[PDB]
Design a protein around this ligand. Structure first.
Ligand code: NA
Length: 130
């Protein structure tokens, strides 16, 4: 499913993301936007380390979910990577929350640093009723 901007903003708000570990909803929106264009079925294979990024937040199989094909990988979110390809993003949100409960927080995603950090992210939630 490819979410419409405001549709997604309310979806994430209902899932408890607004301000989770100090991260505003607009930051999460900016993240999903740059990671997958709000597409829950987005995948990216990394030939170098044989891992794959899954879903709306492009969560990596080396550490966060199990796909059975990433050498020596772990499953910190205790989910099949398939759960990160569902139209319903509840599991993806639970996993993204797990990801930010680590040392770097939202900085865990390089894309956030490149296109969201120290930039205007309010635009992502404007007019969404959140
Ligand atoms: Na894994």
């Amino acid at each position: 499913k490819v979410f419409e901007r405001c549709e997604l903003a309310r979806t994430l708000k209902r899932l408890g993301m607004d301000g989770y570990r100090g991260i505003s909803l607009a930051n999460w929106m900016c993240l999903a936007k740059w990671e997958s264009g709000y597409n829950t079925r987005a995948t990216n294979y990394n030939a170098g380390d044989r891992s794959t990024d899954y879903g709306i937040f492009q969560i990596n199989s080396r550490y966060w979910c199990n796909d059975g094909k990433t050498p020596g990988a772990v499953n910190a979110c205790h989910l099949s990577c398939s759960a990160l390809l569902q139209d319903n993003i509840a599991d993806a949100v639970a996993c993204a929350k797990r990801v930010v409960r680590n040392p770097q927080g939202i900085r865990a995603w390089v894309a956030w640093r490149n296109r969201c950090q120290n930039r205007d992210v309010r635009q992502y939630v404007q007019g969404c009723g959140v």
